Write a protein that binds this ligand. Structure first.
Ligand SMILES: [K+]
Ligand SMILES: [K+]
Ligand SMILES: [Zn+2]
Lengths: 49, 98, 370, 37, 53, 237
């Protein structure tokens, strides 16, 4: 239809793409958090000895 | 300081990425008057309220988006001006006072 | 070679998991939160994080009674139908509930505090932190006001093996009555507490409560009123402490850093901010004495987490950025997401003349000293 | 209000622990693997 | 030697915990990406059907 | 203040979810050590294996709390007994169940985070505003003419008393100051906007008041007449 219907399609794919961007943004931050926690634990055990 | 807050604060990028930041005065129910100083915006807002474009709640919320918590004294201005008018009424009717 | 000195910092990973009651204002969970920020600011590279050695029965009865500690060590939330005499006697059941792992919680707190005392005794540190400690409302014979085992007394006793004078500063909004009652008749520990004196808990702390026996003039109370701000507080805080440090001349400080004296707390009624609250800690630290800094109150957990994080980074000698890095509890810190707690527009009740009066009175009392 | 006094209960039932058929299945599996001793 | 043995065991356990945590995060994210794709496909199809009707 | 209370309720629900999930994950962290010991021993040992009364960890209360929450307190004794007695059979089952429950709870928490976000934003900003609502009353009882004249008369009477005490009492009881000369023009602006857009008086009354205010302000405070023109209209029709 190359028309207003395509506009509806694009305003739906906008929603899908922002969702996907939010998810892939959560992921990297969580992996950073995990990296921090584990480096902490490692140095802590060595110092305790 | 009202202007130093209006134009010199920067969000936390981490909460910008995750889509958490929402500033008010970008959501108010209406738009805010624009000027060179905040004080002018405050005056335009009191004027709008006295007209009727703005309700009491929107006027207070705009005052909060502008000044913070140090602008509560102005929540009553309308009432206050009303009372002042009343005074003039008496002073405009005393025959010897002229 | 041995370089600078770092801040010892006691933490036990189980401590976050103890839960008082359904809607209880006290949540040990908050310590977890503090740590999750200390990790994510990469602060742990400037500290020495140590795991506490849980304290035993023969360590808690150096201050409390055998019957009280025995009841602690025996009770469980299920078999408390057989302890109904002990509930009355020991003041346990409504404000200080019996929950799961009560004794383990108390052992973690007391162990952190005694460990800090041993750290200073040994020379390994000059500052030592333990945010799970600082339960200043617990009496020798009873439980009182969210606290069960008064670990500041145990820290002080362990400190008095080699130091001749100790000073205990208390800035929780309440009166630190357990730690006063313990050292009320002695001149080796001077207590000094700033609190809201009125129709308020616990009800004690009157300005003419200044010790008996040998401990005459060795307790200090500063009874304030509502809504006090940062500059009023500073005006009444800095003179008192300056003259205590001048005239009493301690050798070791125990600083209780409660944070229900902050603006917007669930129970307290003061009006300080993050900078106003941290002013006290920085001023006390500026004197160069062995120091312990313990936790205390604090019943709005977002504010407490941010303030204790800031003060930890400030004792370590660092300077933290004001944006919160991503951590596991980021959604508690809305909507600014900043390392800052803000005051409000509640009304102050401490007129200038009142503060001048009490400051003068207290300074005369302290002039009685040596 | 009917809305917020509803989301309160909606939150409350969130945690809810395990369900009944699930613990039954875990128990049956336990006993079965105990037979294989 | 008791100390050395305890430390080495705790380091091994840390390394085996990090793996579980990372797999937990990855699974959590796969769930949401699949949910987004599924919901969007269903939305587009339902709209096509609605326009045809 | 109802807004602080809304914030406190929200924080309570947040904490609820977080505490359940954190305790569950600590127990899982414990079981993940016994599982990886199990899978690294001969097949005969797995049968002669037993765990002490503290399940191999430091703090049994957390573990029993987790179990009672997940399995209910009616089937928890069986699970604890079989976890102590024969681990090699009972640890995999429980570990997998706990993992499933954790997954579900994390999903629910992620679902509720957004509703809570909007509630917090709606309630937050007017919570550092304790005195914003305790003022729409005090200002009233300080704007009553009765209060004004009463205050004046009490001041005069006590000042006369001090005058009869032999004390030093000045002539004026009120000392006001007006530094900025423009704020009065702005107050005039407000006056004009009100007069035009007030639904109380009639046009001629607003006209008389406008002209009188023009004269009186320009004269008393000594501010040029010309500034007052645009805001105080002479004709209100
Ligand atoms: K105090
Ligand atoms: K004393
Ligand atoms: Zn307190």
């Amino acid at each position: 239809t190359h028309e207003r219907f395509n506009a509806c399609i694009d305003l739906i794919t906008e929603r899908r793409d922002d969702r996907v961007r939010l998810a892939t943004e959560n992921l990297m931050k969580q992996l950073g958090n995990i990296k921090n926690v584990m480096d902490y634990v490692t140095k802590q055990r060595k110092y305790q000895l | 300081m009202a202007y130093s807050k209006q134009h010199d604060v920067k969000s936390n990028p981490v909460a910008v990425e995750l889509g958490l930041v929402r500033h008010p005065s970008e959501r108010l129910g209406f738009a805010l008057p624009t000027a060179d100083t905040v004080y002018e915006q405050a005056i335009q807002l009191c004027e709008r309220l006295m007209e009727g474009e703005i309700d009491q709640n929107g006027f207070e919320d705009a005052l909060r988006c502008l000044y913070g918590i140090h602008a509560f004294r102005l929540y009553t201005v309308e009432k206050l001006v009303t009372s002042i008018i009343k005074q003039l009424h008496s002073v405009t009717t005393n025959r010897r006072l002229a | 070679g041995f370089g600078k000195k770092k801040v010892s910092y006691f933490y036990d990973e189980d401590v976050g998991n103890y839960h008082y009651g359904p809607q209880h204002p006290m949540k040990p969970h908050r310590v977890r939160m503090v740590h999750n920020l200390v990790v994510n600011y990469n602060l742990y590279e400037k500290l020495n994080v140590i795991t506490p050695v849980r304290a035993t029965r023969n360590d808690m009865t150096r201050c409390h009674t055998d019957e009280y500690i025995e009841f602690l060590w025996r009770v469980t939330p299920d078999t408390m139908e057989k302890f109904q005499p002990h509930q009355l006697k020991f003041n346990v059941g409504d404000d200080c509930p019996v929950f799961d792992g009560l004794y383990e919680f108390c052992s973690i707190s007391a162990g952190g505090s005694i460990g800090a005392a041993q750290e200073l005794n040994s020379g390994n540190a000059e500052i030592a932190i333990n945010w799970a400690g600082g339960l200043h409302h617990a009496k020798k014979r009873e439980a009182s006001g969210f606290c069960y085992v008064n670990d500041i007394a145990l820290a002080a006793l362990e400190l008095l093996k080699y130091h001749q004078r100790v000073l205990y500063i208390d800035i929780d909004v309440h009166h630190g009555d357990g730690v006063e009652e313990f050292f009320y008749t002695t001149d080796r520990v001077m207590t000094c507490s700033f609190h809201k004196f009125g129709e308020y808990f616990p009800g004690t702390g009157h300005i003419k409560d200044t010790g008996i026996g040998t401990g005459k003039n060795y307790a200090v109370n500063v009874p304030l009123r509502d809504g006090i701000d940062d500059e009023s507080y500073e005006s009444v805080f800095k003179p008192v402490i300056s003259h205590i440090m001048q005239w009493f001349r301690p050798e070791a400080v125990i600083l209780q850093c409660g944070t229900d004296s902050l603006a917007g707390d669930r129970l307290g009624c003061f009006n300080l901010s993050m900078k106003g609250h941290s002013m006290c800690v920085d001023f006390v630290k500026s004197f160069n004495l062995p120091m312990i800094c313990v936790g205390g109150g604090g019943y709005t957990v977002r504010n407490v987490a941010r303030v204790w994080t800031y003060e930890t980074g400030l004792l370590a000698g660092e300077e933290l950025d004001e944006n919160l890095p991503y951590n596991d509890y980021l959604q508690y810190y809305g909507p600014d997401y900043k390392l800052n707690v803000l005051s409000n527009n509640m009304e102050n009740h401490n007129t200038r003349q009142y503060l001048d009066s009490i400051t003068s009175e207290i300074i005369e009392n302290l002039r009685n000293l040596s | 209000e009917r809305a917020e006094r509803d989301r309160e209960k909606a939150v409350e039932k969130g945690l809810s622990g395990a369900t009944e058929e699930d613990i039954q299945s875990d128990l049956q599996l336990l006993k079965k693997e105990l037979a294989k001793k | 030697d008791e100390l050395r043995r305890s430390r080495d065991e705790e380091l091994e356990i840390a390394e085996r915990w990090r793996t579980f945590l990372v797999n937990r995060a990855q699974e959590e994210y796969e769930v949401e990406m699949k949910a987004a794709k599924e919901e969007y496909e269903y939305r587009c199809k339902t709209l096509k059907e609605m326009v045809l009707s | 203040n109802q807004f602080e209370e809304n914030l406190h309720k929200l924080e309570e629900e947040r904490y609820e979810y977080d505490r359940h999930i954190g305790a569950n994950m600590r127990f899982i962290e414990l079981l993940q050590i016994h599982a990886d010991k199990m899978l690294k021993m001969s097949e005969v040992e797995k049968a002669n294996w037993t765990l002490p009364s503290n399940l191999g960890g430091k703090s049994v209360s957390i573990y029993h709390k987790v179990i009672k929450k997940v399995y209910g307190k009616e089937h928890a004794q069986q699970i604890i007994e079989n976890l102590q007695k024969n681990p090699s059979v009972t640890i995999p089952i429980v570990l997998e169940r706990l993992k499933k429950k954790d997954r579900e709870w994390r999903s629910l928490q992620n679902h509720w985070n957004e509703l809570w976000h909007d509630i917090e934003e709606k309630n937050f900003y007017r919570s550092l505003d304790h005195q914003g609502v305790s003022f729409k009353s005090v200002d009233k009882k300080s704007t009553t003419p009765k209060f004004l004249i009463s205050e004046l008369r009490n001041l005069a009477q006590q000042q006369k008393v001090e005058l009869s005490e032999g004390k030093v009492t000045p002539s004026h009881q009120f000392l006001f100051s007006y530094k900025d000369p423009n704020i009065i023009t702005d107050i005039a602006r407000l006056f004009g906007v009100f007069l035009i857009h007030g639904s109380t008086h009639s046009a001629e009354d607003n006209e008389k008041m406008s002209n009188f205010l023009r004269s009186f302000l320009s004269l008393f405070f000594d501010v040029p007449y010309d500034s007052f023109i645009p805001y105080l209209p002479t004709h209100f029709n």
